[PDB]
Amino acid sequence: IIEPSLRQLAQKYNCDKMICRKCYARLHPRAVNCRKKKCGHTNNLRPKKKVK
Amino acid sequence: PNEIKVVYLRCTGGEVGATSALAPKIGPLGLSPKKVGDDIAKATGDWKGLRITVKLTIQNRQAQIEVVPSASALIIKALKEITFDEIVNIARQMRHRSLARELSGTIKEILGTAQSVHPHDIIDDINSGAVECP
Amino acid sequence: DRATWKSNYFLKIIQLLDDYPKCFIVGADNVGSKQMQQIRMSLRGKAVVLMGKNTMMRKAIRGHLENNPALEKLLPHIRGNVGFVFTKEDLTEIRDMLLANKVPAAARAGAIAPCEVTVPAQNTGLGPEKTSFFQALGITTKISRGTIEILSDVQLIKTGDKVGASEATLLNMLNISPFSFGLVIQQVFDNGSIYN
Amino acid sequence: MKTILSNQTVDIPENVDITLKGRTVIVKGPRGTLRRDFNHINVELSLLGKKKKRLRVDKWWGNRKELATVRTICSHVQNMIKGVTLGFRYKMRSVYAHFPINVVIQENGSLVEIRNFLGEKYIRRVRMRPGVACSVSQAQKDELILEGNDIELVSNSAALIQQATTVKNKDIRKFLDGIYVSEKGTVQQA
RNA sequence: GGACGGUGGCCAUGGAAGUCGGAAUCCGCUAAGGAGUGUGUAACAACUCACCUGCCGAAUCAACUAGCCCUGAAAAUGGAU
Ligand SMILES: [Mg+2]
Ligand SMILES: [Zn+2]
């Protein structure tokens, strides 16, 4: 019964994020290169999949 | 509120449809027309035009009056069984003709390319019926 | 085409200021195309108003102003969202008409209110189901004839404040006139003179 | 390439004064006192304003890596000035699906108890940083207010609360429970 | 802030309205309109996008290229510039 305005805030910290394809890190949605060393700061980033 | 609001547009035509049309799918919106309200609109809305017929209606509680916005890409198929500058001269003046326009030749320069579905050479250098509209 | 756009814009504005040496400047608010088309429909019979890049108008009058002298005072007088409106008539002709046909475009979330508007005590006239706006804002409205009714002199908005969410959403449905604004005139320039 | 000088000057309001000892900044304002040193960054600190208190930081012969620290310090000083005159107020909203989150504030607002997160009997005891005051607001149904002088401590304290309420071995996209920061406001709204 | 009429464009039809697709791309208005870059809706709708304007007053952006470094880079007794 979560009303949408609070629902959007929760999804900000849980769904609105980019994912590195090589090391599965969690990145801010506006990122361009992964911040993690072990993936070599690659650029292959995909949006985090939704629940739909 | 004029006792009613039926401003929403209807897009049925050609075959009568009735039961198989979209009107039963839109019926629970207002609860006033039901089977006896859309059919009397269909009785006058069967023609003008015999196409998808994006049209508007005004309700008189029990009765209705229907006016069809003369869509340019609809009336071309409605008149389809070339310039045809004569048929665009008459049927488009009764259109509300807002178009965010300022000049007179807006209608001819608009529909002359809306009929492309090329009639653009007539658009570029047009000289017959320059002051035809007023 | 951008360079030709710049050259064309100088040409039209310089054949319009030379046409109208009596030149007025006006500061437009964050207004939509309807109100630009409103002044266009209300003035195109004898004049025209245009919008463009602010630096462009200064460059059109920086070295190319020399066609007619005594116009040089316009450089330090054009700042902010202001332009040039050209007309042939006297000082009082355009000021009263342009400041009278102000479109009440309602209050957006985050609008300034220099004008004081106070809600009176009257019957609102809408349904008895949206009392949550009045109860949360501090106004006690009692149901009379199934209608919301303001029963007391209550403040609505101060001077020099910012409209809130609950302050604006009730303002839209209440059908009460809010603060108005529009194409407010800055000043004039009557061939080498500046007046209020 | 080594840039000769990359300076950046901040402005100090007259109601607050700054005294510099080496690379240690002492900020003394109406809402309290803030000290933070910058010995780890090789910069030159100068006070320009005997009249309006302009503070200037300088870096001589730096590479692209270390010119970034110049404004990093400047933002830190602006945060210090902001804290000692306005203070940082963080609003956290507790969101839940079936198990309502119960929050109890302990002594002086320095300790927070979370009782029924996701309906588990474990009791979470998160301790705030010193100088950070937390409280349950009266403004809304579910709001926690964190007020303190340093944005460093306050945001760290708030993030500790948020990270504590973390769902485990579940689909975090569907299970939306947890206390999340809503906005980063100020106090006294000046 | 605007994202205009044909335009719910044609043909696919059981919806494909700008966004599933086979193809053509136009103007009166303007600083704005792309019959639509995307999400999304059975479809609507809802935005946003490209397009400029208002403050904002000095350099910025893109594609490359090769030096160092990083990732790519996992084996068994504890050890090798
Ligand atoms: Mg599982
Ligand atoms: Zn990575």
From Swiss-Prot, chain A:
<feature type="modified residue" description="N6,N6,N6-trimethyllysine">
    <location>
        <position position="22"/>
    </location>
</feature>
<protein>
    <recommendedName>
        <fullName>Large ribosomal subunit protein eL40</fullName>
    </recommendedName>
</protein>
<comment type="function">
    <text>Component of the 60S subunit of the ribosome. Ribosomal protein L40 is essential for translation of a subset of cellular transcripts, and especially for cap-dependent translation of vesicular stomatitis virus mRNAs.</text>
</comment>
From Swiss-Prot, chain B:
<feature type="cross-link" description="Glycyl lysine isopeptide (Lys-Gly) (interchain with G-Cter in ubiquitin)">
    <location>
        <position position="77"/>
    </location>
</feature>
<dbReference type="GO" id="GO:0070062">
    <property type="term" value="C:extracellular exosome"/>
</dbReference>
<keyword id="KW-0597">Phosphoprotein</keyword>
<keyword id="KW-0832">Ubl conjugation</keyword>
<dbReference type="GO" id="GO:0022626">
    <property type="term" value="C:cytosolic ribosome"/>
</dbReference>
<keyword id="KW-0689">Ribosomal protein</keyword>
<dbReference type="Pfam" id="PF03946">
    <property type="entry name" value="Ribosomal_L11_N"/>
</dbReference>
<dbReference type="GO" id="GO:0016020">
    <property type="term" value="C:membrane"/>
</dbReference>
<dbReference type="GO" id="GO:0005829">
    <property type="term" value="C:cytosol"/>
</dbReference>
<dbReference type="GO" id="GO:0006412">
    <property type="term" value="P:translation"/>
</dbReference>
<dbReference type="InterPro" id="IPR036796">
    <property type="entry name" value="Ribosomal_uL11_N_sf"/>
</dbReference>
<dbReference type="GO" id="GO:0070180">
    <property type="term" value="F:large ribosomal subunit rRNA binding"/>
</dbReference>
From Swiss-Prot, chain C:
<keyword id="KW-0832">Ubl conjugation</keyword>
<dbReference type="GO" id="GO:0022626">
    <property type="term" value="C:cytosolic ribosome"/>
</dbReference>
<dbReference type="GO" id="GO:0002181">
    <property type="term" value="P:cytoplasmic translation"/>
</dbReference>
<feature type="modified residue" description="Phosphothreonine">
    <location>
        <position position="55"/>
    </location>
</feature>
<comment type="subunit">
    <text>P0 forms a pentameric complex by interaction with dimers of P1 and P2. Identified in a IGF2BP1-dependent mRNP granule complex containing untranslated mRNAs. Interacts with APEX1. Interacts with FMR1 isoform 6.</text>
</comment>
<dbReference type="GO" id="GO:0022625">
    <property type="term" value="C:cytosolic large ribosomal subunit"/>
</dbReference>
<keyword id="KW-0687">Ribonucleoprotein</keyword>
<dbReference type="GO" id="GO:0005925">
    <property type="term" value="C:focal adhesion"/>
</dbReference>
<dbReference type="GO" id="GO:0005634">
    <property type="term" value="C:nucleus"/>
</dbReference>
<feature type="modified residue" description="Phosphotyrosine">
    <location>
        <position position="20"/>
    </location>
</feature>
<dbReference type="GO" id="GO:0036464">
    <property type="term" value="C:cytoplasmic ribonucleoprotein granule"/>
</dbReference>
<dbReference type="GO" id="GO:1990904">
    <property type="term" value="C:ribonucleoprotein complex"/>
</dbReference>
Curated annotation (Swiss-Prot), chain D:
<dbReference type="GO" id="GO:0006412">
    <property type="term" value="P:translation"/>
</dbReference>
<dbReference type="GO" id="GO:0022625">
    <property type="term" value="C:cytosolic large ribosomal subunit"/>
</dbReference>
<dbReference type="GO" id="GO:0022626">
    <property type="term" value="C:cytosolic ribosome"/>
</dbReference>
<protein>
    <recommendedName>
        <fullName>Large ribosomal subunit protein uL6</fullName>
    </recommendedName>
</protein>
<dbReference type="Pfam" id="PF00347">
    <property type="entry name" value="Ribosomal_L6"/>
</dbReference>
<keyword id="KW-0687">Ribonucleoprotein</keyword>
<dbReference type="GO" id="GO:0003735">
    <property type="term" value="F:structural constituent of ribosome"/>
</dbReference>
<dbReference type="GO" id="GO:0002181">
    <property type="term" value="P:cytoplasmic translation"/>
</dbReference>
<keyword id="KW-0007">Acetylation</keyword>
<keyword id="KW-0963">Cytoplasm</keyword>
<dbReference type="GO" id="GO:0005634">
    <property type="term" value="C:nucleus"/>
</dbReference>
<dbReference type="InterPro" id="IPR036789">
    <property type="entry name" value="Ribosomal_uL6-like_a/b-dom_sf"/>
</dbReference>
